Amino acid sequence: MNKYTIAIDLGYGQIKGINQDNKRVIFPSIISSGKDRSDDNIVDNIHVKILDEYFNEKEYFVGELAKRQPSNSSFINRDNKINSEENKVLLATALGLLIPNDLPNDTKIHIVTGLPLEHFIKQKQALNDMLKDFEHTIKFVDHNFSRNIKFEESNITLFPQGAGAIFSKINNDISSLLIKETFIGLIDVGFKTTDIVVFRINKDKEPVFEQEMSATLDGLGMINIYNTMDKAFTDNSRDGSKLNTEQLMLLCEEGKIFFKGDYIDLKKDLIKARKTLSTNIINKADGLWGDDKNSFNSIMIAGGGGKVLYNHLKLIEPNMCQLIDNPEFANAIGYLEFGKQF
Ligand SMILES: Nc1ncnc2c1ncn2[C@@H]1O[C@H](COP(=O)(O)OP(=O)(O)O)[C@@H](O)[C@H]1O
Ligand SMILES: [Mg+2]
Ligand SMILES: [Mg+2]
């Protein structure tokens, strides 16, 4: 009785996913009501329908396709909720893309997912509850295929973020991380939260979680830069005009947007927002690691935020800190290695 393993990292910014055949998908965590659209990649054209027990077919665009719409799942103003309509569509769209076409009668889907470090205790059951209740057919209308998502209880496993990304053997060299009596830190800078997780290495090269030197920062993530640039845009505009989410996201890539025949350059505020977010995250990490900061052998930052802020984040200890090889799929790969050896 085999089982197929799909690792899915759920974010308030980007859904990341990878099954045990090393097929990865990633797309923005925005959905949108769908419509008859009337070597293109499927990930940029997610027109989809979801069938349930009520025989509701709910129609959605999700990902890049939904990003390019007037109506949107909020990005800034998406209330934090672990089981919602949008996390169900986003979870079922990531599954739908990572489920093969010829699974045997014996092979069933095993999902590995989780919560941020300190969010785990609070929301392990609510996430295990939404997964238990999955009873949906996900239909990719423009791509002639559909999948059924049903979860066998404890055909699913939940892991707090942090351990998996660290322990990994594809994005790390765990031979060089196993040093006696030293620490190893992770700084996963995400969209709404930021995880700081450290592990003490035993004298027998066994790693131990240090809850004390670890937190989940609830007010610091890349969303701070989005809001500061949203206010910088209306403020600079002095028109009372606001961007939509496709524009605001572009305005936070480089700080340039072409709006109503005006070249809006806010790169000066974007740089300041990134230094200001990065300062806080370095301060919190220093706050948790006192003089024990000298006892580290690596401090690896990761996530989408870690990728864009690495040059600021590195200042926390420049000759010792590094960027993990695939920052955004760093927890999702940890979720694969942990689920597969299970
Ligand atoms: N090329 C890029 N330029 C600027 N920002 C980026 C880029 N790629 C990703 N990001 C930022 O990183 C975020 C993705 O973070 P992610 O690793 O998904 O964390 P979470 O798991 O909390 O969603 C996006 O919302 C975006 O703001
Ligand atoms: Mg994340
Ligand atoms: Mg906290």
Author numbering: 1 to 38, 46 to 349
Please give the exact wording used by the authors of the publication that reports this structure.
Functional ParMRC plasmid segregation systems comprise an actin-like polymerizing motor (ParM), a centromere-like specific DNA sequence (parC), and an adaptor protein (ParR), which attaches a plasmid, via the parC, to each end of the growing ParM filament or filament bundle. Thus, the force generated from ParM polymerization is harnessed for plasmid segregation. Here we investigated the ParMRC cassette from pCBH, a 257 kb plasmid that carries the botulinum neurotoxin type B. This ParMRC cassette is also found on other C. botulinum plasmids, such as pCLK (267 kb) and pRSJ2_3 (245 kb), which encode neurotoxin types A and F, respectively. Despite the similarities to actin, pCBH ParM is a genuine ParM, since it has a closed β-barrel, a feature that is missing from actin and MreB structures.
Mutations to subdomain 2 (F42D, I46D) and subdomain 3 (S298D and R299D) were expected to disrupt intra-protofilament subunit contacts, with subdomains 1 and 4. X-ray crystallography studies on the quadruple mutant, using the cryoEM density map as a molecular replacement model, led to the 3.25 Å structure of the monomer (G-ParM), which was subsequently used as a guide to construct the filament protomer structure in the cryoEM density (F-ParM). This accounts for the success of the quadruple mutant in the preventing filament formation and allowing for monomer crystallization. The major difference between the monomer and filament protomers was the folding of a disordered region into a helix in F-ParM (F helix). This region is equivalent to the DNase I binding loop in actin, which is generally disordered in G-actin and becomes ordered to form a defined extended loop in F-actin. The nucleotide-binding site in the pCBH G-ParM and F-ParM structures contain ADP and the magnesium ion is coordinated by Asp9, Asp195, and Gln168 equivalent to Asp11, Asp154, and Gln137 in actin, suggesting a common mechanism of ATP hydrolysis in which Gln168 (Gln137) directs the hydrolytic water towards the ATP γ-phosphate for nucleophilic attack. Actin residue His161, which has also been proposed to be the catalytic base in ATP hydrolysis, is not conserved in the pCBH ParM structure and has the opposite charge, Asp202, indicating that the conserved glutamine may represent the evolutionary conserved residue important for hydrolysis.
